[PDB]
């Protein structure tokens, strides 16, 4: 049982110091058994075992003991794992002086040298006075595991851990607020560090793992368009490569390429479908990213009136030869009201080649009356090459694939246009990012690094509705968050001139919220009965108004954005001014804040960030906060999150006091209350929202799921003003207790 140091120097067995470590880890908790941990851990101890395995196995044996009756083993295992992190990093437990650590890391080349170029030794000392190292104990087990496996500055090909979470937070804050007048930048850093290490604001994986280091690509989500030409396709592939190499999830609008059978080069060759090009983009996105901090993901969009849509709706399928399937790239279908009425009337929908009908493609997005007129005219014309598919057939096929493979996302364009902060005529919206979460204007390219194209880069953040106790902390957090995100917008490094142009000219953002389930269930409400419409209206009015007011203060202080004359906030129109009227019958809360005064203020001055709010899935970043992943309800009082960094048990927050007030995903009678909540959110939020759907056959007769119910939920999500539909989480009664 002899212990072995990290270099070979064996030593006699010493388990009593490890027992002391366990008694420190489990100090101040309840309903735990270090004796049970010892019994479960003292079996896998062969002779001459190391300490890098004693600690790993004891953490695993004390972490697999999380359940719905002893929920303090999460804190036990988190404290054990953070002890192991301190050990592996700094040898001992006592963290080092911040200045010594940062200078050693810049010597190693880990951090950035502008930190030492800007700050001084006295500033680093008084910042060391800020850090709260004993805050680490406040982590959850999934928090520490995700942090260690993905966030801390580390070597990949070796597996070495350098820093701690406190240094991570303090240096994120420092590098965020280093370009400010020295009088108050230290106070800004102190306040932002307090607000980010008290879990009052969450910040995503890209910036959370990137703003310390010489790698500079903090834009979480990227949006690219693809013209109808080989040069534009090469530019799209090059962009995909250069960005997925830098921790970015892609949204590709490829629904502009001509369809199969369309002539090429004035009529000498003939096209061969878009499956080869989709395969090419898939191999581009999947190639140069797997080694990094995360995998490469790219959603691909097309409009449902595409000619090949009957063969493109399936590509994500499970039953087909590789030669006609691309099943590692999420898909997105763009549909609107003309298609919906062709469905309801049961009439035929026609399909044209999106490059053989003039103006129809951009009519589809810009003006719906133009779309109607051109659709009817080209249907009447009897010289085009067109196809004809029954509407119930096509919509049922689409929902069938959506349910079968979970990942055929749905995008209603006309809401993204007629309810947005951009105007539909000079800067329309033709796509969304990977998670159907944002919506920004783009333009096709011609070369890799030209200036006549745009690639929409958007960074993200979110609030923690499970930490705030009123609705003024939201405004303070808003001013801090907008400051930080504009700092990053100007501090980034853009590998493509087109994206640099777009991001610097629009200063777009995204700030959503997490922990919504814990908020809405601490206020004694639910998702199903429809008793949270008022609370959602109130909370999201507060969020949007505080964001706009903070951005207006920032615009007054440091000028507007260099493309404001292309937004819909210059002509003085607000989300409460242009929301969808059908949201009236399902909500009766009035507007609280001084929206008309804010409107005249932004009219006179302008906004700094052209797009403030957007609601995010927040899968990974919401685990460090021990929060709930956004607007979704949990799936169990002990939920299991499954990532490549280990499967993780996570107790829903304050379970011991709210073990009867939540509403787990598999208890709601349906998704109508949740679709209404999402409709209200979308009304009050500028750009798109990532909304899921749920379907449990065990709540239907004959074990089926009625396509009538699928289509009714889709048409309701459209009628109540929801831009997009993200998932189709499908249950399956695979029960095996053991």
């Amino acid at each position: 049982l002899l212990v072995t140091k990290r270099d070979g120097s064996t030593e006699r067995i010493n388990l009593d110091k490890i027992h002391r470590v366990l008694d420190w880890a489990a100090e101040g908790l309840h309903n735990v058994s270090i004796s049970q941990v010892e019994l479960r851990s003292h079996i896998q101890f062969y002779d001459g075992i190391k300490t890098s395995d004693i600690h790993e196995t004891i953490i695993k044996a004390a972490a697999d003991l999380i359940s719905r009756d002893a929920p303090d083993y999460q804190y036990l295992a988190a404290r054990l794992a953070i002890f192991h992190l301190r050990k592996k990093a700094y040898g001992q437990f006592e963290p080092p002086a911040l200045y010594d650590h940062v200078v050693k890391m810049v010597e190693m080349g880990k951090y950035d040298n502008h930190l030492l170029e800007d700050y001084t030794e006295e500033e680093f000392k008084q910042m060391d006075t800020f850090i709260d190292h004993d805050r680490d104990m406040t982590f959850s087990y999934a928090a520490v595991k995700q942090l260690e496996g993905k966030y801390l500055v580390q070597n990949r090909v070796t597996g070495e851990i350098y820093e701690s979470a406190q240094f991570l937070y303090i240096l994120v804050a420092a590098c965020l607020f280093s370009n400010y007048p020295r009088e108050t930048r230290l106070q800004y850093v102190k306040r932002f560090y307090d607000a980010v290490s008290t879990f009052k604001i969450s910040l995503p994986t890209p910036i959370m793992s990137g703003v310390r280091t010489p790698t500079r690509q903090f834009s979480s989500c990227v949006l690219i368009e693809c013209g109808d030409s080989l040069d534009s396709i090469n530019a799209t592939s090059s962009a995909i490569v250069k960005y997925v190499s830098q921790r970015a999830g892609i949204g590709i609008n490829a629904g502009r390429i001509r369809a199969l059978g369309s002539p090429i080069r004035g009529g000498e060759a003939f096209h061969t479908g878009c499956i080869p090009f989709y395969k090419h983009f898939q191999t581009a996105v999947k190639s140069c990213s797997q080694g990094g901090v995360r995998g490469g993901a790219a959603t691909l969009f097309y409009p449902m009136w595409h000619l090949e849509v009957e063969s493109l709706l399936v590509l994500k399928n499970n039953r087909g030869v590789e030669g006609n399937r691309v099943r590692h790239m999420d898909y997105g279908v763009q549909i609107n009201k003309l298609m919906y009425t062709r469905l309801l009337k049961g009439e035929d929908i026609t399909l044209f080649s999106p490059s053989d009908v003039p103006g129809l493609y951009d009519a589809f997005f810009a003006d719906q009356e133009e779309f109607e007129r051109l659709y009817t005219k080209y249907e009447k014309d009897d010289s085009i090459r067109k196809q004809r598919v029954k509407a119930v057939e096509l919509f049922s096929l689409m929902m069938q694939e959506r349910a079968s493979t979970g990942r055929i996302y749905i995008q209603n364009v006309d809401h993204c246009n007629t309810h947005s902060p951009f105007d539909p005529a000079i800067a329309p919206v033709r796509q969304s990012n990977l998670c159907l979460e944002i919506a920004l204007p783009t333009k096709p390219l011609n070369d890799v690094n030209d200036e006549n194209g745009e690639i929409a880069l958007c960074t993200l953040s979110a609030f923690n509705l499970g930490a705030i106790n009123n609705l003024d902390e939201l405004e303070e957090l808003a001013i801090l968050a907008v400051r930080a995100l504009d700092a990053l917008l100007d501090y980034q490094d853009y590998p493509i001139p087109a994206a640099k142009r777009g991001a610097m000219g629009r200063r777009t953002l995204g700030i959503g919220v997490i922990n919504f389930a814990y908020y809405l269930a601490k206020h004694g409400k639910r998702y199903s009965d429809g008793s949270a419409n008022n609370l959602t209206h109130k909370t999201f009015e507060a969020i949007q108004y505080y964001l706009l007011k903070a951005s207006n203060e920032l615009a007054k202080e440091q000028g507007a954005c260099p493309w404001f004359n292309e937004t819909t906030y210059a002509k003085g129109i607000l989300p409460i001014d242009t929301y969808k009227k059908d949201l009236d019958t399902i909500a009766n809360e009035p507007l609280h804040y001084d929206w008309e005064a804010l409107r005249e203020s932004i009219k006179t001055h302008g906004l700094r960030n052209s797009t403030l709010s957007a609601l995010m899935p927040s899968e990974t970043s919401s685990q460090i906060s021990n929060a709930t992943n956004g607007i979704e309800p949990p799936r169990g009082y002990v939920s299991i999150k499954a990532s490549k960094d280990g499967i993780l048990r996570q107790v829903v927050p304050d379970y011991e006091h709210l073990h009867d007030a939540y509403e787990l995903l598999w208890e709601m009678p349906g998704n109508d209350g949740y679709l209404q909540l999402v409709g209200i959110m979308q009304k009050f939020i500028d750009q798109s929202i990532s909304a899921n759907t749920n379907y449990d056959p065990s709540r239907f007769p004959s074990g089926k799921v009625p396509m009538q119910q699928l289509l009714k939920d889709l048409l309701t999500a459209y009628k109540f003003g929801v831009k997009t539909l993200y998932y189709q989480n499908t249950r399956d009664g695979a029960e095996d207790a053991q």
């Binding site: 079996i43 896998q44 062969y46 395995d53 196995t57 695993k60 697999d64 999830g249 999947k286 797997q290 995360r294 995998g295 993901a297 499970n318 039953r319 590692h328 009201k337 009425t341 469905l343 309801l344 049961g346 119930v392 069938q400 349910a403 079968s404 979970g406 990977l434 899968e619 949990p634 799936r635 002990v638 939920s639 999150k641 499954a642 990532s643 490549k644 960094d645 280990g646 499967i647 598999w666 056959p697 004959s702 074990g703 089926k704 799921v705 009625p706 396509m707 009538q708 289509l711 009714k712 048409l715 009628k719 989480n729 499908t730 249950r731 399956d732 029960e735 095996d736 207790a737 053991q738």
Partner: protein, 375 residues
């Protein structure tokens, strides 16, 4: 005798489970037992090809993990490949002649096809992580422990098809063949059928779950994640096979077909207890064959032996037999994460989700009720 279509009409709602008339046309409206039709539907909706979980990172993880762990993984996969070949081939030829109800015979055929897909999957996740599938697949057949387990399972199938060929060629009673007397007794045929069923239940109950325990204990420690997901799909289908066989033989034994079958159930029940003991001993010996070069993190001889004992306890108690060990707790409590697929909020865009249901939707649109919907 046997025939693929008997002209004598009969109400298929009154024929016994086994040994009745060769089945007429297959229909799925007037169904005698509901469990088998439910399982047919579930496994028609659980369809999954093996090429949907990109394991490209797991080739790296495997060719990086050490030698004894390489041995563990590849040995478990070889053994499972052999046994799923055997068990995708046997049910058809053994239990298919002895079926009197169409729901049961098509459940048998769907079970055989599911095991075919399973063997294809194992072969696929062997053909990926190494460069010598030839030597791996040849060591499969040649290896001593693999061979002994496969023999221990296949002997019963051999004896049962032998006796069924006897009973379908000669007839009932005592008969003389090639100058030697044979005693084809339908009672002994039923006893051999129940013995075969209980051996198959043992097999798909304890052995494969020990193997899954090992291959999932790998992926608890951040390794072989796509392979773990594929074997998760496989463990789902295997739990479904397990419940199927369980209900089948429990219905036979309870006394829903014949009191003589109940008496045979008592005798062969003692015999099946002494059979399950041998199965558990074989699995313990396989455990101490795998874990000799040294343990991994969280899996060794003691833990895997504990798991064998506990899983045999549970399968016995659930199959209506005695308890040979003490009813202790679960030694690897983290296997419920891989088996129970209800509260596992997987994070997509990284790892594929195994919760789809192929084509299990009605698709009967009420276009008029839709037309009464103003947008």
């Amino acid at each position: 005798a046997y025939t693929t279509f008997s002209q004598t009409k009969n109400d298929q709602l009154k024929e016994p489970m086994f040994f009745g008339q060769p089945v007429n046309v297959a229909r799925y409206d007037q169904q005698k037992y509901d469990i088998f039709e439910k399982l047919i539907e579930k496994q028609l909706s659980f369809f999954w090809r093996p090429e949907q979980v990109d394991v490209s990172r797991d080739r790296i993880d495997y060719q990086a993990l050490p030698e004894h762990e390489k041995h563990i993984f590849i040995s478990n996969l070889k053994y499972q490949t052999l046994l799923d070949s055997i068990q995708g081939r046997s049910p058809n030829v053994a239990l298919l002649p002895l079926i009197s109800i169409p729901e049961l015979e098509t459940w048998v055929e769907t079970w055989a096809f599911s095991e075919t897909i399973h063997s294809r999957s194992y072969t696929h996740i062997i053909r990926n992580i190494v460069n010598d599938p030839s030597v791996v697949f040849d060591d499969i057949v040649t290896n001593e422990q693999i061979q002994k387990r496969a023999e221990g399972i296949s002997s019963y199938y051999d004896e049962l098809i032998e006796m069924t060929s006897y009973w379908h060629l000669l007839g009932e009673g005592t008969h003389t063949v090639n100058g030697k007397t044979v005693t084809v007794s339908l009672r002994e045929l039923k006893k051999k059928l129940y013995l075969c069923l209980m051996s198959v239940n043992a097999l798909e109950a304890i052995r494969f779950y020990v193997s899954f325990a090992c291959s999932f204990a790998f992926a608890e420690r951040e390794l072989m994640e796509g392979n773990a997901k594929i074997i998760r799909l496989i463990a789902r289908d295997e739990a479904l096979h397990l419940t199927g066989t369980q209900h089948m033989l429990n219905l036979l034994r309870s006394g829903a077909d014949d009191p003589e079958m109940a008496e045979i159930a008592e005798e062969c029940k003692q015999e099946c207890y002494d059979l399950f003991v041998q199965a558990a001993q074989q699995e313990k010996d396989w455990a101490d064959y795998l874990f000799r070069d040294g343990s991994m993190i969280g899996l060794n001889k003691d833990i895997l032996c504990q798991y064998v004992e506990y899983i045999t306890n549970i399968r016995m108690q659930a199959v209506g037999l005695d308890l040979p060990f003490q009813t202790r707790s679960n030694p690897i409590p983290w296997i419920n994460t891989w088996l129970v697929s209800d509260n596992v909020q997987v994070a997509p865009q990284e790892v594929e989700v195994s919760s789809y249901l192929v084509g299990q939707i009605d698709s009967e649109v009420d276009t008029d009720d839709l037309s009464n919907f103003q947008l």
